[PDB]
Every structure is written in structure tokens, then in C-alpha cells.
């Protein structure tokens, strides 16, 4: 679960660990 | 399926069904509904996706969703309505 | 709040045949869905509130759409909402 109002922080650093999306 | 005589992805009866959980509720109000949010999602998908593109790598990240709508000045104004609450 | 994963991923396919999507970024996707949805449900209420029998049809739909999507985006989507309704009345 991640807020929409994460696309408000100042600069989005990439999480390494961002796994994919497995469909 | 409604989806299908829609001609969309989207889930028209899903949606349906939680216009009427909040008087008739026509299912052309979910249709319309899903239209409009399966046109914004392939908006801020296409865009963000170009923006993953560019930068030589093969998926969408939160970064590339920030680049594509910091990119649109519509798009950023939608998503800073939402967030603030209209 | 719903899931929206299946079909944000489905035209994640459409739009970038061969692009993946991380688990973060989708989560951010099912909160733009759920998010956006829940404003345009919110004033298309608001609007069939002023209804004798509060009747929601696409009318309220595209209403709550021109006054919450800007310029462009809400011409845009109100061509798509009307050309999926004007298909849905012709087809079983």
C-alpha cells in the first residue's frame, strides 16, 4: 500500500528493493 | 459483460456496485465512470512508461509516475487537487 | 477502497506492450484509481442529492467530471465516457 500523496515529496528516491509487480 | 458492450477494462459492474453502496443508479453512470478512469490510468501509464523508456530501463517506477506527471501541467494540477482534497 | 491492480496492469499491456511495473508503483496506481474515483462519486452524490428521487445516471458522471479534471483531460475524458455509454445502449 503506498499513498497517492507520495508523488508529493519533494524528490522520489528509488527503493532498490522495489519488487515487480507479478501479474 | 457491461465491460465488454462498454468496450473497456475497467470493471463497470464492480464500480456499479459501489455507486449503489454510497435513489436508481443506472449502469451507465459506472460505465461512464470506468471510461474516465481507465483514460486517466492510460494517460499517466503511457507517459510514465515513455519516461522508462527514455531513462533505458524496462519498467515504471515511482520516479517515472513523478516525471510523467510532474511533465503534464494537467495532470500535475489533477493529482494536486486530489491530494489536497479539492 | 477496492483493488485495481488487474486492470491497471491490463492497460499497463495495452499502452507499453513489453513494460513491467514495480509493486510500489502500482500501489501508487490503485491509490490514483481509488483516489480519483472516490472524488467523482463523491460530487456525482452531491449533484443527485438536488434530484427529486436522487437518480444518478451519466449526466451526474460527466458533470462531476468537467468540474474536477482540467482543461484538456476533461474534454478527453468526456468523449470517452460518452463514446462507452453510446456503445453500451447499442450492444448485448
Redesign the interface.
Known amino acids: ?4 500523496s ?2 508529493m515529496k519533494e524528490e522520489i528516491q ?2 532498490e528493493d ?4 507479478v ?1 | 459483460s ?1 465491460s465488454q ?7 463497470v459492474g ?2 456499479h456496485r ?2 449503489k453502496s ?8 459506472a ?16 507517459l ?3 519516461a ?2 527514455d531513462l533505458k530501463v ?5 520516479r ?2 513523478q516525471l510523467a506527471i510532474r511533465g503534464d ?3 500535475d ?3 494536486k ?2 491530494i489536497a482534497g ?1 | 477502497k ?1 483493488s ?2 488487474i ?6 499491456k ?3 506492450p ?12 490503485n ?3 481509488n ?3 472516490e ?3 463523491g460530487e ?2 452531491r449533484l ?1 442529492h438536488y ?1 427529486k ?6 449526466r ?3 458533470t462531476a ?1 468537467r468540474l ?6 476533461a474534454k ?2 468526456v468523449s ?6 453510446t ?3 447499442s ?2
Open positions: 500500500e503506498v499513498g497517492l507520495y508523488l528509488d527503493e522495489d519488487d515487480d509487480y501479474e | 457491461r458492450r462498454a468496450g473497456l477494462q475497467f470493471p464492480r464500480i459501489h455507486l454510497r435513489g436508481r443508479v443506472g449502469a451507465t453512470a460505465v461512464y465512470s470506468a471510461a474516465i478512469l481507465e483514460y486517466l490510468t492510460a494517460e499517466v501509464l503511457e510514465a512508461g515513455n522508462s523508456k524496462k519498467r515504471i517506477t515511482p517515472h509516475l501541467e494537467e495532470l494540477s489533477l493529482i487537487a486530489t479539492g | 477496492e485495481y491492480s486492470y491497471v496492469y491490463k492497460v499497463l495495452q499502452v507499453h513489453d513494460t513491467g511495473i514495480s509493486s510500489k508503483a502500482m500501489g501508487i496506481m491509490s490514483f484509481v483516489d480519483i474515483f472524488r467523482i462519486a456525482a452524490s443527485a434530484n428521487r436522487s437518480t444518478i445516471t451519466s451526474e458522471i460527466q467530471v474536477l479534471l482540467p482543461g484538456e483531460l478527453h475524458a470517452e465516457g460518452t463514446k462507452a455509454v456503445k453500451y445502449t450492444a448485448k
